[PDB]
Design an enzyme around this catalytic site. Sequence first.
Site, short mmCIF file in Angstrom:
data_model
loop_
_atom_site.label_atom_id
_atom_site.label_comp_id
_atom_site.label_asym_id
_atom_site.label_seq_id
_atom_site.Cartn_x
_atom_site.Cartn_y
_atom_site.Cartn_z
N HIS A 2 40.72 44.45 56.83
CA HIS A 2 41.36 43.40 56.03
C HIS A 2 42.39 43.98 55.08
CE1 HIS A 2 38.54 40.29 57.34
NE2 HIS A 2 37.52 41.08 57.04
N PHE A 4 44.73 42.64 53.41
CA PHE A 4 44.87 41.92 52.14
C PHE A 4 43.59 41.90 51.37
CE2 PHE A 4 44.34 37.86 49.80
CZ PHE A 4 45.14 38.21 48.67
N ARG A 169 51.84 37.00 57.32
CA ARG A 169 51.29 37.49 56.03
C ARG A 169 51.80 36.69 54.85
NH1 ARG A 169 47.24 39.91 57.87
NH2 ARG A 169 46.95 40.81 55.76
N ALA A 171 50.20 33.85 53.88
CA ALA A 171 49.03 33.45 53.11
C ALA A 171 48.72 34.43 51.91
CB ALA A 171 47.79 33.22 53.99
N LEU A 411 36.61 19.10 48.07
CA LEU A 411 37.29 17.97 48.73
C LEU A 411 38.23 18.36 49.92
CD1 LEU A 411 38.14 16.21 45.41
CD2 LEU A 411 36.26 15.47 46.96
C1 LIG Z 1 41.71 33.76 39.35
C2 LIG Z 1 42.63 32.93 40.23
C3 LIG Z 1 42.51 33.31 41.78
C4 LIG Z 1 43.08 32.17 42.69
C5 LIG Z 1 43.12 32.65 44.20
C6 LIG Z 1 41.68 32.77 44.73
C7 LIG Z 1 41.62 33.10 46.25
C8 LIG Z 1 41.89 31.78 47.09
C9 LIG Z 1 41.75 32.16 48.58
C10 LIG Z 1 42.30 31.03 49.47
C11 LIG Z 1 41.15 29.99 49.56
C12 LIG Z 1 41.62 28.91 50.56
C13 LIG Z 1 40.62 27.74 50.71
C14 LIG Z 1 41.11 26.88 51.86
O1 LIG Z 1 42.03 26.06 51.57
S1 LIG Z 1 40.37 27.03 53.44
C15 LIG Z 1 41.60 26.10 54.50
C16 LIG Z 1 42.66 27.07 54.93
N1 LIG Z 1 43.64 26.32 55.68
C17 LIG Z 1 43.63 26.13 57.00
O2 LIG Z 1 42.71 26.60 57.71
C18 LIG Z 1 44.77 25.27 57.54
C19 LIG Z 1 45.34 25.92 58.86
N2 LIG Z 1 45.65 27.33 58.82
C20 LIG Z 1 46.68 27.85 58.12
O3 LIG Z 1 47.43 27.09 57.46
C21 LIG Z 1 46.87 29.32 58.17
O4 LIG Z 1 46.18 29.85 59.26
C22 LIG Z 1 46.28 30.02 56.90
C23 LIG Z 1 47.01 29.61 55.65
C24 LIG Z 1 44.78 29.77 56.66
C25 LIG Z 1 46.42 31.52 57.08
O5 LIG Z 1 47.77 31.83 57.36
P1 LIG Z 1 48.07 32.76 58.67
O6 LIG Z 1 47.17 32.52 59.82
O7 LIG Z 1 49.55 32.62 58.85
O8 LIG Z 1 47.61 34.22 58.22
P2 LIG Z 1 48.55 35.30 57.42
O9 LIG Z 1 49.16 36.35 58.32
O10 LIG Z 1 49.51 34.67 56.54
O11 LIG Z 1 47.44 36.04 56.54
C26 LIG Z 1 46.30 36.64 57.09
C27 LIG Z 1 45.38 37.01 55.94
O12 LIG Z 1 44.88 35.75 55.42
C28 LIG Z 1 43.50 35.78 55.49
N3 LIG Z 1 43.00 34.40 55.72
C29 LIG Z 1 42.96 33.67 56.91
N4 LIG Z 1 42.39 32.44 56.62
C30 LIG Z 1 42.09 32.45 55.29
C31 LIG Z 1 41.54 31.48 54.45
N5 LIG Z 1 41.14 30.27 54.95
N6 LIG Z 1 41.31 31.76 53.13
C32 LIG Z 1 41.69 32.97 52.65
N7 LIG Z 1 42.31 33.91 53.43
C33 LIG Z 1 42.48 33.67 54.74
C34 LIG Z 1 43.20 36.72 56.67
O13 LIG Z 1 41.79 37.03 56.56
C35 LIG Z 1 44.22 37.77 56.43
O14 LIG Z 1 43.83 38.68 55.40
P3 LIG Z 1 43.39 40.18 55.82
O15 LIG Z 1 42.14 39.88 56.57
O16 LIG Z 1 44.59 40.68 56.57
O17 LIG Z 1 42.91 40.88 54.54
O1 LIG Z 2 34.74 16.81 58.88
C1 LIG Z 2 34.32 17.85 59.41
C2 LIG Z 2 34.49 17.94 60.94
C3 LIG Z 2 35.97 18.06 61.20
C4 LIG Z 2 36.60 19.30 61.32
C5 LIG Z 2 37.99 19.32 61.53
C6 LIG Z 2 38.64 18.07 61.63
F1 LIG Z 2 39.94 17.98 61.84
C7 LIG Z 2 38.02 16.83 61.50
C8 LIG Z 2 36.66 16.86 61.30
N1 LIG Z 2 33.74 18.89 58.72
C9 LIG Z 2 33.38 18.76 57.40
C10 LIG Z 2 34.23 19.20 56.32
C11 LIG Z 2 33.81 19.01 55.01
C12 LIG Z 2 34.62 19.38 53.78
C13 LIG Z 2 34.59 20.89 53.55
N2 LIG Z 2 35.88 21.16 52.91
C14 LIG Z 2 36.13 22.28 52.23
O2 LIG Z 2 35.26 23.16 52.11
C15 LIG Z 2 37.45 22.47 51.50
C16 LIG Z 2 38.12 23.76 51.96
O3 LIG Z 2 38.97 24.28 50.91
C17 LIG Z 2 39.02 23.60 53.18
C18 LIG Z 2 38.23 23.25 54.44
C19 LIG Z 2 38.55 22.03 55.06
C20 LIG Z 2 37.89 21.63 56.19
C21 LIG Z 2 36.87 22.43 56.72
CL1 LIG Z 2 35.99 21.81 58.16
C22 LIG Z 2 36.50 23.62 56.06
C23 LIG Z 2 37.21 24.04 54.93
C24 LIG Z 2 36.81 20.02 53.01
C25 LIG Z 2 36.11 19.09 53.97
C26 LIG Z 2 36.48 17.60 53.70
O4 LIG Z 2 36.11 17.28 52.36
C27 LIG Z 2 32.56 18.37 54.75
C28 LIG Z 2 31.70 18.01 55.82
C29 LIG Z 2 32.17 18.20 57.12
CL2 LIG Z 2 31.26 17.71 58.62
MG LIG Z 3 52.07 33.79 57.73
#
Ligand SMILES: CCCCCCCCCCCCCC(=O)SCCNC(=O)CCNC(=O)[C@H](O)C(C)(C)COP(=O)(O)OP(=O)(O)OC[C@H]1O[C@@H](n2cnc3c(N)ncnc32)[C@H](O)[C@@H]1OP(=O)(O)O
Ligand SMILES: O=C(Cc1ccc(F)cc1)Nc1cc([C@H]2CN(C(=O)C[C@H](O)Cc3ccc(Cl)cc3)C[C@@H]2CO)ccc1Cl
Ligand SMILES: [Mg+2]
Length: 411
Positions: A2, A4, A169, A171, A411
């Site tokens: 990892h 990052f 990279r 994210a 949420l």
């Molecule tokens: C004190 C204040 C602090 C505040 C900040 C606190 C931290 C908050 C942390 C964020 C909390 C988020 C809570 C939510 O909202 S979880 C929901 C995340 N969103 C999605 O899944 C939506 C669809 N996917 C995307 O939009 C992209 O795939 C994302 C944005 C997820 C990655 O973009 P991409 O695919 O283009 O990748 P990259 O090349 O840019 O980057 C790759 C690096 O990113 C690491 N990665 C992959 N997925 C996640 C993930 N879900 N949390 C943290 N890191 C993640 C991965 O391990 C790798 O790191 P390393 O393994 O190389 O080390």
């Molecule tokens: O709704 C689903 C199934 C599903 C997955 C993907 C879809 F497109 C539609 C449905 N999963 C699911 C997701 C949640 C919640 C969990 N949740 C989070 O943890 C917030 C995170 O920062 C981002 C995240 C969003 C969605 C998921 Cl599945 C996991 C993580 C947001 C989701 C909505 O409030 C709570 C309970 C369930 Cl069953």
């Molecule tokens: Mg990227």
Amino acid sequence: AHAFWSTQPVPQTEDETEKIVFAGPMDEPKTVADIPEEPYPIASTFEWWTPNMEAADDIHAIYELLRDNYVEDDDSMFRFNYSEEFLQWALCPPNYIPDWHVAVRRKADKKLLAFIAGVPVTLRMGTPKYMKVKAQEKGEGEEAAKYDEPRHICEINFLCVHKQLREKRLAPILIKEATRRVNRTNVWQAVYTAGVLLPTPYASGQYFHRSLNPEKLVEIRFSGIPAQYQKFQNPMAMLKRNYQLPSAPKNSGLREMKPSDVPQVRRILMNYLDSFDVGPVFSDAEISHYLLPRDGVVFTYVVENDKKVTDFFSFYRIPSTVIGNSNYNLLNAAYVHYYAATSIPLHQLILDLLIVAHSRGFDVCNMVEILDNRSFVEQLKFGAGDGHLRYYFYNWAYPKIKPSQVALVML
Ligand SMILES: CCCCCCCCCCCCCC(=O)SCCNC(=O)CCNC(=O)[C@H](O)C(C)(C)COP(=O)(O)OP(=O)(O)OC[C@H]1O[C@@H](n2cnc3c(N)ncnc32)[C@H](O)[C@@H]1OP(=O)(O)O
Ligand SMILES: O=C(Cc1ccc(F)cc1)Nc1cc([C@H]2CN(C(=O)C[C@H](O)Cc3ccc(Cl)cc3)C[C@@H]2CO)ccc1Cl
Ligand SMILES: [Mg+2]
């Protein structure tokens, strides 16, 4: 492995995590003064943007980015479609910080490319109870209690990189700039959840779903008719029968929450959440914001007989896009939110939740196995879904806990 996450103040392995006995920070204490004033450097074709959440157009841009690019299920059959009204409610709680909403736009056309949001939350996150018992046994109670007071930290949600910009990279840059903005307000911890494995979660729980319109769920392939139903002459009719609900609530006394209930719901909720190791502390303004009903977004009911609120439940709505069905565009899903029962058993309170959600046209009710959500899974015919939700802190050492010790709904 990892590039990052190995540079960040988080536990790096489950071993690391196994040796944690007290809550507290990972990093060196720092000051606001130490943190760079200027945004993190970015590629000259992009620019940082702080959206105004009071502006309909800025909410709309974030809504389109998430509609097309946010979380999908593992089979790419569904993608979340948070509404604009939902995003305004989630992104702007009382005393939110507008600077914590971080976006990246392409300079040439101002197209939104990436987003991350932080909101303030006050969270109990001191040493868990099981670890406090072990501490007392060692004579180490004072160290265990040092971070017992509720802390003002950031809850991070809505990280999203446009599909064309994936695996560049981007994210990490968003996360580092969010961290910079949060730190410039003197906040040093964050809590976040993900349905992926990252270094390193403090709790993990299964998802659960309760069919409310099984015929639609099967048509959009959210659900399959299970194998066992084939022994029947009419598998679908027996499935509909299995999940049928009353038309109307069973508890007299059930009505929608209204502003005058805020103090009593705050009381019963805070008394309930107290029992959990990690959980939010809500002010009256926060109870108002997160629980008062809002059309299309959040639905809240209280049980009041003899003018006292004794129980309540809430759920919120998130529709998902159904990626290419001739028949259906949308899955309308209800998510269990906070609740508290003091006078009736929890299965009976949540049954009224399902009945209310069904009557309002939701297809499925979803939840994670936090709070006391396990106590009603069997009776209320919830099934475990696929995978797990993991809970994380940033800059907070924390002993592994069970998801039933977690009371923060994300949420
Ligand atoms: C004190 C204040 C602090 C505040 C900040 C606190 C931290 C908050 C942390 C964020 C909390 C988020 C809570 C939510 O909202 S979880 C929901 C995340 N969103 C999605 O899944 C939506 C669809 N996917 C995307 O939009 C992209 O795939 C994302 C944005 C997820 C990655 O973009 P991409 O695919 O283009 O990748 P990259 O090349 O840019 O980057 C790759 C690096 O990113 C690491 N990665 C992959 N997925 C996640 C993930 N879900 N949390 C943290 N890191 C993640 C991965 O391990 C790798 O790191 P390393 O393994 O190389 O080390
Ligand atoms: O709704 C689903 C199934 C599903 C997955 C993907 C879809 F497109 C539609 C449905 N999963 C699911 C997701 C949640 C919640 C969990 N949740 C989070 O943890 C917030 C995170 O920062 C981002 C995240 C969003 C969605 C998921 Cl599945 C996991 C993580 C947001 C989701 C909505 O409030 C709570 C309970 C369930 Cl069953
Ligand atoms: Mg990227």
